[model samples]
Target: EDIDVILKKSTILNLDINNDIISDISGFNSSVITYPDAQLVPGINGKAIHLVNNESSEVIVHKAMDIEYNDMFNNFTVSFWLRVPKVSASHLEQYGTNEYSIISSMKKHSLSIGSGWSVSLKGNNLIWTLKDSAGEVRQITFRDLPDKFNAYLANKWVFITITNDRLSSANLYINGVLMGSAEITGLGAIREDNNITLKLDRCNNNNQYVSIDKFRIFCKALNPKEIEKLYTSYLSITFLRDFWGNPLRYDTEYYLIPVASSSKDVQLKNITDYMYLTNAPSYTNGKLNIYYRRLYNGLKFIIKRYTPNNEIDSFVKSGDFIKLYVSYNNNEHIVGYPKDGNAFNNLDRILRVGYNAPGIPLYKKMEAVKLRDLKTYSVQLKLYDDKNASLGLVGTHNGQIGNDPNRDILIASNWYFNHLKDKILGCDWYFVPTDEGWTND
Candidate 1:
């Protein structure tokens, strides 16, 4: 219930540093410096300030604060989302390297006065560097890009997080996964210098052409699980309710109604049935049901659920005995599984469900819910094929349709057979007019 309040209070720096929306919620002084040939274009969540090869162009934010080096360097976390445009190989060859800055607060050359840090990309790998009190640079690098990393770079948004603990070490993460860590010993204090500045997309003479958004900084280092939560919060799918509000049963159907948006209309379809519908029954008393019948052989279907209200209720079912519930309070939902009917185990923010059919498979596309709702709220269900596509219109029913003894409705459909005229007759065996003449092909 209080998680939202806690998160909001802990955030020390939150900036939507876009082209048209350059503002900081943490009351920090921020501004942009646009140069010739520089561009401001749309990005993953909003506008991204783009910088070309021209070194003169960049965006900088100055966060003037009063804190000792021990407190600032010992416990802190920095995170952001970024996408780099494809630069020609010739540019890399001309520059003799492919390292470019995404965002940083460290001086390009040296600390000379105060401590600073930087997070940047070199080739396809990520590099994190910190300048200690003694002016020595300590770094951790994630070497070698895997197939998934390359795929993310190709027209996908990437989330990066860097965490440092003064007592133990510093760690780097990509999309909530720990990529690398470096231990620190005898790290010095950051000098209290008023010249500290946070620069985005520029480092000394090198300027990068990249789209960056949702830059945040925290005064405390986040744990691995906390980092993962941050990543999931930015995902396309999120859980809005938990079991506490209503029990979510297997084989039970739920409807995803579209929330109004000014930019686009939302479309939803059941992937398994290719059942297209503009709207499903609304949430009344929190009950919805979906039914299916077999039309083909060797097919199965599965339904998965995901929620972000609370992590404890986000457990993956290992078997039938592990049932979960959601507890709602103060506009926040916490997910947890029952513990001896009195207590519960709260876990993560994801839950999944599965369904299967055998012997002349009636359905096989449970994972096919596809949704396209830019700048809007919507739901998606996986669809399999176009077989019996029209049946989707009647798939959803009110709770009273089945649970009430007095109220029941038949929901079934059958494929119709078609006949064709034949005109082929063999020369050796022609149709006999005496038998009401029927042709044989």
Candidate 2:
């Protein structure tokens, strides 16, 4: 056992522009320089390092660090001061971009925090669309930011910090306070490709540019409380997802059951007055049958669909988890996706979880089965807020239906966000018999 390996942990103190010899924050490259007239402000609250904007945008790129880890826990923390301009055309390149950026090296375990901030990684970009007391949200990416621009003293000072570990566990801090924490379980790609580097680049792209002072990185993961101290005191910026400071997307659906009880007062009433079709499979001659199970009251539930071939379908439901098995044919189901052909985004966007039956009478057991005699039929489920149709449920196929070789289920509902929460009505379930039924392989 080694107490500590011989790792070259780097730490810089009092980075000033006047010191010409050691001015460049980029320890190796000569292009990086410290902005002149950037003063260090001291106060009883806390000393804030200032990067005042003067004649032009100032950039200080740190020299790259050659760090290596093999599933080992490596922590990183980057903090600094910033004041976003109210209305500026020059977009600030606060974090990483291009090849030498930190995002290219760390991949998924990176994040960014700032005024009107936006984070992008693995083709997923999150920007602050609304700037409030907490922060803003990005319209394009639909991501929220820390400390909305409106809430902060624009011309005053604010601090931000981002910290991340190899495990994809990260936290965001604003004004020395804990803002949010996200678990990056899908941070698998970074570990497979193991090489680490750090960089800072500024491009006069946006109309606005930010001042940066007292930036640092730590290898050890810091706890939430410790992070708050640094952020509140130093006005730091923390990047949690990738080097680009993009927020990692948690596509997994989280089921939250607000109410639970064996209440006979409940009744199933259509919320949206919409109907959905339940898809059947193509088996030899066995009639396609679908069944439903009512779980115990108060029990948390989530549903993960599996194709006839055993591959997990992107459709995940979290609520009173219900499993709807499709049979009649082999493996044939249709999945949706973005126009960009990104299957993950399709899965993330299309798959939804909501109420199956609302204000409906509770039955100890329920099952919907289809027989072989049914020539052409479809199955679907509807969600209701309070006995009104809110959203529609599409069915899945176990195997190819009616000669379609691909084992996929097509969504028959209007794929729109406005229809997602229409007070889900009871779903319409059916099946179309082509020439076969589905059987468990």
Best by TM-score: 1
Q: Candidate 2: lDDT of 440? A: 21
Count of steric clashes across candidates, in order: 23, 114
Q: What RMSD does each model have against the real structure?
A: 22.0, 23.5
Give model 2's TM-score versus the native structure: 0.31
Tens digit per residue, CA lDDT, model 1, 233-288: 66433232111111123322232221221111112121111111132222111111
Q: After superposition on all CA atoms, how large is the RMSD of candidate 1?
A: 22.0
Per-residue lDDT of model 2, residues 58-121, tens digit only: 3344343443322333455555554433221111123222211211122233442221212222
lDDT of each: 0.41, 0.29
lDDT of 2: 0.29
How many backbone overlaps does candidate 2 show? 114
